[model samples]
Target: VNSFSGYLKLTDNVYIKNADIVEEAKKVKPTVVVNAANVYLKHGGGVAGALNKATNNAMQVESDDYIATNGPLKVGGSCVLSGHNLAKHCLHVVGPNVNKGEDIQLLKSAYENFNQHEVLLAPLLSAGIFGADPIHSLRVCVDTVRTNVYLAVFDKNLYDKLVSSFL
Candidate 1:
């Protein structure tokens, strides 16, 4: 909410569909967009999965190279890639799938990994296949970003709920 000069601006939004994220990311012309990737650097699930598919598998080859070069990502670590089909860059952060249970700290750490990017695009993590409660997950994500961050949610109902809560 509050405005600042190049000081990480944090904000969130809800789109009518998951596919809409591509359009939203374009608006920001973000320096890099983040993927909610798991330890393997595979964009097989959640936001990464969608982007991977939509990008014509552009992220896959890069992810493979990243894994080979850096090893599999750790729970709190990341992989950044170029040759991006959408944004100029893509950041892959290893976030807890959270299907087992909520791991707010792990989620928080992944979000904070990009705290310094001038502009970033991330998912409302853990709220997807990870099954985190939307409200709680959104809060933890907001805490980490702190500024100049954009959260794109595919679910419309969830967006309305977030809007109401933020208001």
Candidate 2:
């Protein structure tokens, strides 16, 4: 499906859902940032020690609310949905398959609001996102007036059934 914005009452359909067209669900210009430094450091040597420094800085950014919550877990080249992030309610959508539409949708919904983002955010695509890109996951949010959309593709397909399932 294509990326779109509209208004109307809460919805179970794809695209923009809920709220009235006149209700003014302002679209926030989403931002994408690399936050995979910690896990990269966790590899070994002083890297693990570096994780602490990055983690601490991340924790501080997360506390700011402006940040989308930096994470240190990586799930198969995707962001890891484990650790305190899960306890803190971080959603993990996993997908490299174009058929995994539902997986991407859940990710869009998760970061729909600016208030739900982290300061120093990170995707599991370490080394320049390794191989996965937002298009391979969330469709479109990389250009134009876009906001950050985290693909919980790291998690099992639990939330991957609705990529195109109208609700």
TM-score per candidate: 0.80, 0.22
Candidate 1 overall Cα lDDT vs. reference?
Answer: 0.67
lDDT for model 2: 0.28
Residue 126, candidate 1: Cα error in Å is 2.0
lDDT by residue (tens digit), candidate 2, 1-167 = 22234322113221323221111111221232222333222322121223324344443344233224554433322242322221232222222222322243333332332223442122322212333343333233222113333322222232333244322
Best by TM-score: 1
Model 1, 58-131: lDDT tens per residue?
78877888778878887767767872666778877776666765465787787777776766666766668876
lDDT of each: 0.67, 0.28
Error of 1 at 73 (Å): 0.7
Candidate 1, residue 41: how far the Cα is off, in Å = 1.3
RMSD of each: 4.8, 14.2
Candidate 1, run of 10 with poorest lDDT: 1-10
